[PDB]
Amino acid sequence: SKLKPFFALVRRTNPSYGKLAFALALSVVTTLVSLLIPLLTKQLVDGFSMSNLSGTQIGLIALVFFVQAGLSAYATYALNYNGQKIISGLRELLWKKLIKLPVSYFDTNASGETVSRVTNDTMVVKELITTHISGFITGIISVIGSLTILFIMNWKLTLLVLVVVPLAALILVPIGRKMFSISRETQDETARFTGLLNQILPEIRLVKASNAEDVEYGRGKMGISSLFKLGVREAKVQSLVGPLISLVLMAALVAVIGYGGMQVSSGELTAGALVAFILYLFQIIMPMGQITTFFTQLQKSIGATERMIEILAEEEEDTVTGKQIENAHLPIQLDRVSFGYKPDQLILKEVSAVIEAGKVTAIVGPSGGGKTTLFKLLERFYSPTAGTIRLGDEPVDTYSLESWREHIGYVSQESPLMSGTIRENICYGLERDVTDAEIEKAAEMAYALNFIKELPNQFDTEVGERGIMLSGGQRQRIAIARALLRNPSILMLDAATSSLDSQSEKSVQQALEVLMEGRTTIVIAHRLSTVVDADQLLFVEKGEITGRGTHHELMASHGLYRDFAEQQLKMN
Amino acid sequence: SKLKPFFALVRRTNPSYGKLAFALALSVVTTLVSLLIPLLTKQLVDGFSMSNLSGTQIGLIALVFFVQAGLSAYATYALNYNGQKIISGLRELLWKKLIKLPVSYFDTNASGETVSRVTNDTMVVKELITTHISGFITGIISVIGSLTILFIMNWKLTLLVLVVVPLAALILVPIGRKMFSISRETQDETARFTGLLNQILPEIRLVKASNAEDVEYGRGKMGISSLFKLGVREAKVQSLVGPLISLVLMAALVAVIGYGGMQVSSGELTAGALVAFILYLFQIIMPMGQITTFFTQLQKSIGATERMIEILAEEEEDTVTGKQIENAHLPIQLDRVSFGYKPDQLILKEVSAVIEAGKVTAIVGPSGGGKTTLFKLLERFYSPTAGTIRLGDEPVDTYSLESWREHIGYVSQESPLMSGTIRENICYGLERDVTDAEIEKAAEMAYALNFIKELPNQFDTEVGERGIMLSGGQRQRIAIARALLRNPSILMLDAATSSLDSQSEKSVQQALEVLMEGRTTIVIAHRLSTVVDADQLLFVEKGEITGRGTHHELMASHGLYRDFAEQQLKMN
Ligand SMILES: CCNc1cc2oc3c/c(=[NH+]\CC)c(C)cc-3c(-c3ccccc3C(=O)OCC)c2cc1C
Ligand SMILES: CCNc1cc2oc3c/c(=[NH+]\CC)c(C)cc-3c(-c3ccccc3C(=O)OCC)c2cc1C
C-alpha cells in the first residue's frame, strides 16, 4: 500500500523496467551460481586426496568464480547505471517544479529545507534502488538457499546446532543496549562538564577580580569527580560487558564448528562437507548486515518519497492567466484588497490607492507595516483574495503574467549579485533578442560603462562562485542598465539607495531619474531624501493606507507629526 | 624518545604502576589461555569420536572459558577503573593550572579551544591508556602465539598457504583507495551542486521577475547531467570493485580452508587440527583491526600529550609574591608607562596620569586607541615593560597585588552569572564571609534588595543556566551591591552598551553615587552621562594620555576640534 506512491514516483521517469528487470534477474542468477561454490569445493577435497580429478576440478572451480564475478559485474552496472538514470531525470522533474511551481510565498517557508530535499532524498532513493532492494533480494535468496542446502546436505543435525546459536546469542543484544545507554549517558555527562567549563572560563575576568579561584577551582574538583564516579560505573559495566561478547562467541564457534568434528571424526563422510559447511556459514553471515540495513533504510526511503511527492504537487498559472498585453501605460488602481497570507490573518484590509500614468509613487511606513506586502501584491507575487487591481476594463486577472512581469523592471535594497561572470548579469533578461553588441551603449546611457571601464575583460570579470568580489552599492548601476535596456515601461525600486552615502546615490540617480523619469515608478522608501522626488506618497499603518497625495500636501494634511516623529527617530 | 614526555605526564599522577602492571600481566595471561583454548578443542573432537572421555573433557572446556573470561574481567576492570584514576587526576592538574596559570591575556587567545584541550584531549589519552596499549600488547602476543602454534602444528604447509593469502590480498587496498577517491569526488560534485542551488533558489524573486526560468532551468539541466555523467563513471568503477572483493576474498577461503580439506581427506591426522586451525583463524583475524587502530591512534595520542604539556607550562606566580597592603588609599600616579603586546608593536607610548585621592577618573578616546588597555593596566591584568606606577611605585610593586585584587568594583556589560542563583553569587563572595551573618541588610542598605524584593524564593532562586532570563539592569545593580558590600575602596567600570538607557542607568547612578561618597573610582561609560555623573575626564589618543580638570576646560583646550566628532558619532 505505502509502496504504491514510491512505484508511481519511479514511474514518473519511465525508462526503468526494460533493463531493471534484467538486472534483478541477473543478480538472482549471480546469487544462485554463488550457492554452488561450496558444492564444487566439497568435491575438490576428494579429488585432491587421489590427485588428477583434483587438478581438473581446481580448474572448473576457477571458472565458476570468474563468471560468478563477471556476470555479477554486468549485473550491478546494469542496475547501478540505470539507478543514476532513475535519479537524474527525477531531479529533472523536481527542478522543473522548484522553478516553475513556486509562487513567491510558497518559497518563503524554507529555502534550505527545499534545496536539501533534492540533494538528500534523491541520494536516499538512489541507495534504495541501486543497492538496498537488490541487497534485500540477494540476501533473502542466499539465506534460504544456504538453509535448504544444509537441510538436504546433513540430517538436520549441524543445521540444528547452528540455528540454536542465534537463539542463545539473542541475549547478547540486551548487553549491547546496556552498553549503548551507559556510553550515551557518559557523553551526556561529558557535555555537561564541557558546558560548565565553557561557562566558567570566558568569565575568568570576574574570577580573577576577587581572588575567588580557591572556590572556582573547587567547583571543577566536583565536576571531574562526578565524571570519575560515572567513569567507575561504566568501567564496572565494561568489566561485565567486555568478556561476555568474547565469551559466548567462543562457545558459539566451539558449539558449531567443533560439532562438525564428530561429522569428520567418526560420524559421517563429512571430510569435505565440513569445509562446504564453513563456506555456507560465511555465505549466511554475509547478507545479515545487508538485510537489516535494508529493513532499517526502508522507513527513511518511504519518508523521502513522501517529501518528494509533497513537493511535486501544485503548479503556477503563468499561461493560465491568458494573453492580453498592450501599451500598458494605464494608471493603476487598488480597491479593497484585504488579505495577508491567510484568510483569517488580515495583514491588509480595505485598501484603495490611485497611481496615475507616469507619476512617481513612493511608500512610507513602519517596518512591521504592510509596505512589503503592498509591494509584493503590486508585483503580483501574491494572488489577491477579494480586492481588485484596476486598469482599463479590468484586464489584470488576464494580463499575461509572463508579459506583464516582462514589462516590469525590478531593483531592491539588497541588490544581490547572481554568481558567475559579469556577462551573466549583462545578458540576463535579454531573452528573445541578444541585440548583438548594442549592450555597450545601453550601459553608457546608464552611466555604468564608464564606471566599469576598469574593464578586466568585460566577460571574465567573474563576481565569483560566492559572488563576493564586488561592492554592495555597485550592482545598482548594472541593475538599472539591465532594467532600462529591455523593459522601459514600469520600474519598481525598494530602497536601493539608502546606504550609498550620497556619492553613489547621486551617481545612480543621475542615470536612473534622468533616463526614465517619463515612465511609471513604484518605490519602497526608507528616507525622506528619496520621497521628495516622488510626486505621490502612500503612508501605511496598521495594515491600512492613511496617506495620499504629494509629499508636502500630505505632510501638512495628515502626515504631520505621525511621519515627522518616525522619520526623525530613524534619523536619530 | 617521544614517549618520554607522555611517561612523565602519566608520572605526574603517581597512583599508576602498582595496579597497572598487574592488569597488564593479567591481560597477558588471558591471551595465553585464549591461545590454549583451541588445543583443548582438538582432543574433545577426537573424544567426540571416542564418546565418554569426550563428554568428561567437554566439561574442562567450560572451565577454561569461565576462567578465560573471568580473569579477563578482573583484568580490564583493574585496567579501566584505575585508568580513570589517572585521567580524573590529570584533569585535576589541568584545572589547578587553568585557573592559577592564566593571566588575562593568556585566556584572550582562545576559550573553546581550551575546553576542547581539557575534555576531548583527555578522552583521547584515556582511550590510549585503558584500551589501546592493552590492545597492542594483546594483539602482538596473540598473533605471535598463533603463528608459533601453527608452525609447531602444521609443518610449513597450511601456514604457508595461509600467509600467502595476505600477500595476494594486498592488491585489494589499492582498489579500496580508488573506490574511496571516486566516492569523495562524488560528494565533492554533490556539494558543488548543492552550492549552485543554494546560490539560485534564494534568488527566485529576481529569477521570476525577469521570467528567465526557461534559461535558469537550463543551468539546472547542466548540473544534474554532470552528476549523472560522474555517476555513470563511478558506477563503472563500482562494477569493477564490487565483484572483485567478493572474488579475491572468496578464492582466499577456498585457497586455504579447502586446502585444509586434503589434510583431513588423506593428508594426515588433521581431523581435530582442522577445527583448531579454523578457530585460530578468527583468533588471529580479530587482533589485526585492534593493532591497526592502535598504530593509527598513537600519533593522535602523542599530539595529545604535546598539547597537554604545552598547556601545563608556566604559571602565574603573583599569588605568593607581594606583601604589606594595608590602606589602598594613598595617591596613585601613572608615569612613563608604555606597552602593547610585543616589544615591536607598542600600543601604549610614554603616558602619565595622576588620580590621587580624587573622586573619579574617566578615560575617553577612539575605540582601540587605548581606552580598553588602561582599564586593565590600572588593576594589573597585564604586566607592562613600562615605567613605575607611583603608589610608592606601588611600594615598587611589592604590595601583595594578587590579594589587593579584593578591592575591585568591576562594572561592565556584565551578565557573568556563574552557577545559577543569587545565593550562588553570595557563595562566590565567600572570601571573607566570616561575618556573613550580617551582609544581607547591608544589601538592603545597598538599595538592591528593594528591587530584588520581587523574590520567588530568594534562597534558591534560579537565574537559569547561562543566565538568559534576567534584565540587564538587574545584573548591573546586583553586581554593584555585591561588590560594594565589602570592598568598595576602588571602583572599576567600563560600559559599551546602552540598551536599557534611561531607567537602568539612572537607578544604578544614584545608587552607586550614594554608595561611594568617599572612594576613588575609574569609569569608562559614555560621552556625557559619564561626565555629569563623575565630573572628571582623561582622554587617550594614539596611546598618549592627556587631561587635567573637568569637562569644560578639556573641551576648550583639547576637545574643541576632536570631541565634537565623538559627540556627533555617538548621537548618531
Ligand atoms: C583480553 C584479550 N582479548 C580481549 C579478547 C577478545 O577476543 C575476541 C576474539 C574475537 N574473534 C574470535 C571469534 C572476536 C570477534 C572478539 C573478541 C573480543 C571482543 C569482545 C567484545 C568486543 C570486541 C572484541 C573485539 O575486539 O572486536 C572484534 C569485533 C575480545 C576482546 C577483548 C577485549
Ligand atoms: C551486487 C549484490 N550486492 C552485494 C553482494 C556482495 O556479495 C558479497 C559476498 C561474500 N559473499 C559470499 C559469496 C562477501 C564477503 C561480500 C560480499 C559483498 C561485499 C563486497 C565488498 C564489501 C562488502 C561486501 C559486504 O557486504 O561486506 C562483507 C565483507 C557484496 C556486496 C554487495 C553490494
Curated annotation (Swiss-Prot), chains A, B:
EC numbers for this chain: 7.6.2.-
Domain notes: In BmrA the ATP-binding domain (NBD) and the transmembrane domain (TMD) are fused. This is considered to be a half-size transporter that undergoes homodimerization to be functional.
Gene3D superfamilies referenced in this protein's UniProt entry, alphabetically: ABC transporter type 1, transmembrane domain, P-loop containing nucleotide triphosphate hydrolases
Protein name in UniProt: Multidrug resistance ABC transporter ATP-binding/permease protein BmrA
Residue span, ABC transmembrane type-1 domain: 20-300
Subcellular location: Cell membrane
Effect noted on mutating residue 371 to R: Retains 2% ATPase activity; unable to transport Hoechst 33342. Traps ADP in a beryllium fluoride-dependent manner, confirming ATPase activity. Probably unable to undergo NBD dimerization
Keywords: Antibiotic resistance, ATP-binding, Cell membrane, Membrane, Nucleotide-binding, Translocase, Transmembrane, Transmembrane helix, Transport
SUBUNIT field: Homodimer.
SUPFAM superfamilies with a match to the protein in the record: ABC transporter transmembrane region (SSF90123), P-loop containing nucleoside triphosphate hydrolases (SSF52540)
Domain ABC transporter per the UniProt entry, residue ranges: 332-567
GO molecular function: ABC-type transporter activity; ATP binding; ATP hydrolysis activity; ATPase-coupled lipid transmembrane transporter activity
Outcome following mutation: residue 371 to A: Complete loss of ATPase activity
Residues of the active site: 495 (proton acceptor)
GO biological process: response to antibiotic; transmembrane transport
